[PDB]
Amino acid sequence: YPPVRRDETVVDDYFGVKVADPYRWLEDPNSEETKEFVDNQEKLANSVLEECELIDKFKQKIIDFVNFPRCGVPFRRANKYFHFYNSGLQAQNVFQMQDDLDGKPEVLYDPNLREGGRSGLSLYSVSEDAKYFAFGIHSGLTEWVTIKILKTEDRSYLPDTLEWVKFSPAIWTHDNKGFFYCPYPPNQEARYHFLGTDQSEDILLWRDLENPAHHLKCQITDDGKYFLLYILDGCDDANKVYCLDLTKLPNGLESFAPFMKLIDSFDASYTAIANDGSVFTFQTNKDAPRKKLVRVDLNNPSVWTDLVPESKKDLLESAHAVNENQLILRYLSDVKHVLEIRDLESGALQHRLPIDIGSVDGITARRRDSVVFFKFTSILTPGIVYQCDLKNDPTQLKIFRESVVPDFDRSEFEVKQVFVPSKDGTKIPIFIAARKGISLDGSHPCEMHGYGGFGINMMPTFSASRIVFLKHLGGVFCLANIRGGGEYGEEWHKAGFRDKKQNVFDDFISAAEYLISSGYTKARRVAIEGGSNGGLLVAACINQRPDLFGCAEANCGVMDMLRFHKFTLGYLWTGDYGCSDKEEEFKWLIKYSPIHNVRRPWEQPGNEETQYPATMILTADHDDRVVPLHSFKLLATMQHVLCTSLEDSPQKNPIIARIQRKAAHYGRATMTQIAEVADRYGFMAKALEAPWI
C-alpha cells in the first residue's frame, strides 16, 4: 500500500463533537499530492488486477454478448420517424431518421465522429414539422452543453449556437419559429430562442434571483397553445406549475412574464398529461403517495377533481394521452409493470395488460399518434420494441423490433421474485436470477445490487455482463428493491430517507441474510454492488456488517455525509440525506457516514476471525456530480485504519480503487464501460475464489 499523508491538525466541532478530517487535502483535485495519490492508487490497483486472471475472459464474453444490433423506440414528427441505433459495438448510439417505418434509415447525427464518441447525445429534439433537429454536444469532460441545430433535409447546420445549457430540453413551438430552453447565465432561467438569431436576442420568461437554487423543467401542450414552466427544489418529487397562454399574446413571443401561477408551492408533484382548451389533466402525488390523475379548469383553478383515483396498492408511475381520446397508464405493481388503456374523458378502464418480470418504458407517442411504441427489457430479455396500433388492433401488442444475444440460450436460466422480512418486519421485494434447478446448498457466488433513495425505482433490466456472471461463473444474481426508492410510492421513499436512512441499509443487510439462510450462497461468497447513492449503500453496509460479504464494489459513491453538501451539486440532496449544519440532522448522518465509521471488526469481542471484504472503489477523476474526493478519502481511511496503521494486519483482502481517467459521470463509451465492468467482475471472481466455466 502506498504511503498517504495524514494532516493531524484538521479538526472540526460539530455541536460539541470533535471530528478529525486527516485527509482533507484530497478535496483539492489539482494539488500534485492528490495527483500523486491517484497515480499511486492506480499503480496499486493494476498490480492487484494483474493477479485477477479472469478479467480477459469476462471482457471477451461481455463484448461477444453485447454485440448485437439495437433499435431504440421510434417517435414521429409530421410524417418522419426518428430513433436511435447501434450496430452493436459503436461507442455511442447514432440518431437516425426515416420516412417509412421500414424504409431506408438515414443518419442524422453520429456522436462517434466526435472525440471518438467519448460522449453521446443527452439532449435531442425535433421540430413539429420535422425540418430542424436541435441537439446537445458536450464540449469537454464537463456537464455543460452547446445546443446546435441541423436541417434534416440536407444535414447542414444553422449558425445558431446556444451556450450555457446543462439539462434543459429544447421545446418547439408549433409555428416552428423557435423553442424554449433553460440555460444558466455566463440562477437558472427560462428563455425562448428564435431560429436564425443570436443567443443574445433570446427572450426572457422566468428568473427568480431571490431563490438562486430553484431549478426548472418545461413543456408545451400537444395542441401547442400553452407553455408550462415547472419549478423544482432539490430532488424532492414536488414542483410548482406556471402556465402561459400563447394564444393570448398581442405579438406572439416577441412581446418581451404574465404566467397564470396554478401551483405556487412545493407541496406536491404535478405533470401535465393532456388538456382540452383550458381543461387540464395532471398526474400528481397530492394526498396520494402512489399517484393519481386529477382534472382542473384553468378558468376556475381552485376546483380540482379526481379522474383516475389513487390505487390502494399500485404506483401510478406515468401516464400518456394517445390516440386522440385515450390514456395509457403505466402502473408499478410489486415492482412489475402493468399497462392500462383508459378513456381520457371519463377515466374509465378499457383494457389491462400485466407485464412479465422486467421493465417497460420509453413510451414517446403523443396524443395525436394512433400507434404507440414502447421498450421492454429484462434480465433474460435484451430488448424488444413493441407496438400497439390502438386504432385498428387495440388488444394485441405486436413485436416491431427484437434484439437477439448471440450464443445465449435464455431457457437455461430463470428469474423469481420473492419477498423477505427486514429487521422491522417490513417485507422487501427482491429478484433472484440463476441457472435452472441449482442446488440451494450454500455454494454459489452471489452478486447483490441495490440503490435505496431519491424516489428511484430499480427495475430488473438487461445487462450483458450479468449473463456472463450467471453462465460462466455459476452465479446467482439479486436485485433488492429496498426503501428509499419509489417502488411503493412516496411512503416507501420517506421510510428510507433523512432520519430513516438506516432502514435502507437494514433492508439490504436483510436481503443478504435471506440469501445465506435460504441456501443460495454463504457469508463471504456474497458480493455487493451499487453506484452513487448505491455506493453509499455498499460502503455503509461493509462498515456495519463486514462479516456478511466477500467482495464490495462502490461506484462514484457519496462517502463523507458531513461535507457532501459543500461540493458541486450535492446541496440538492439535503432533501433526502439531511445537512450537517443542523444538530438534529448531524446526529443521523454521523452514524452511517462511511468515512467516519471505518472500524476494525476483529477488535470486537467474538468477531476476531472477521475482516473487511475485498473492496474496489470505482470513480472518474473528473466526476462533476459525486465529486471523487468522497471515493478517495474513504479509500484513504480504509487503507489506514485497516492496513497501514498496523504492523501485520489481519486485513489480507485487498482495498483498492479503479480510477477511470478522462471520463465523466455521464454517458460512457461502450468500450470504456466494458473495460470497467470486465475489471470489476474479474476482481469479484478472485475475491470470492470462484472458478470459470
Binding site: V66, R70, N86, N93, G117, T377, G383, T670
Partner: peptide, 6 residues
C-alpha cells in the same frame, strides 16, 4: 440513451 446494455 446509454450506448450499450452492459
Amino acid at each position: 440513451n446509454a450506448s450499450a446494455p452492459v
